[PDB]
């Protein structure tokens, strides 16, 4: 029940792409992954400049800070969460129906821990430099990540549908 897609972008395109996703997807809540703590804080600052509420969570924080933020997220205080690879036992927030890999992971085990489990969309931002990791992860998981279509069926991720 998670539909996986990729957009092909360059680093300089990623934010405009992300703004278009925010604009056109029927997001209830979303989780956005980056490949480091520093880039997480950078993207949270940027999402806030584009107009969207977000929280953020990363490896360089006290555990209890992270727990409270995530409890505040679960209760709907913000609509988007920006984070690093914090999930071990899966994502059990029901309202999250769109997960975004702002940075594509390197390892298949990283990718699995991001994408289990939003009905939901997993949208991958793929650069030329991610090409080997895309192939490796597709092969290891036994999965296909399809190109993002111009119209995403609402029945794939909006629960009223």
């Amino acid at each position: 029940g998670v539909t996986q897609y990729y957009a092909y972008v360059t680093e300089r395109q990623k934010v405009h792409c992300l703004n278009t996703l925010f604009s056109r997807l029927q997001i209830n809540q979303s989780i956005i992954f980056c490949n480091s703590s520093q880039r997480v804080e950078l993207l949270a600052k940027k999402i806030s400049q584009l107009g969207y509420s977000c929280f953020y969570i990363h490896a360089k924080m006290r555990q209890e800070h992270r727990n409270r933020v995530f409890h505040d997220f679960r209760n709907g205080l913000c609509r988007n969460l920006v984070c690093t690879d914090l999930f071990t036992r899966g994502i059990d927030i029901q309202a999250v129906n769109v997960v975004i890999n702002f940075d594509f992971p390197k390892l298949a085990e990283t990718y699995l821990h991001r994408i289990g489990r939003s009905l939901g969309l997993a949208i991958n931002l793929i650069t030329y430099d991610d090409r080997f990791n895309l192939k490796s992860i597709e092969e290891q998981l036994g999965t296909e990540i399809k190109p993002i279509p111009s119209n995403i069926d609402k029945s794939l991720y909006v629960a009223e549908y």
């Binding site: 957009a7 092909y8 300089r12 934010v15 405009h16 190109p147 111009s150």
Partner: peptide
Amino acid sequence: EEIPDTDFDFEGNLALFDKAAVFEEIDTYE
């Protein structure tokens, strides 16, 4: 930082990546 006034062109940009052809090149040479 670069944000045009129009929606991001997903479709044009996906034409810049011939996924199945790249993968085959990867398997052949890389």
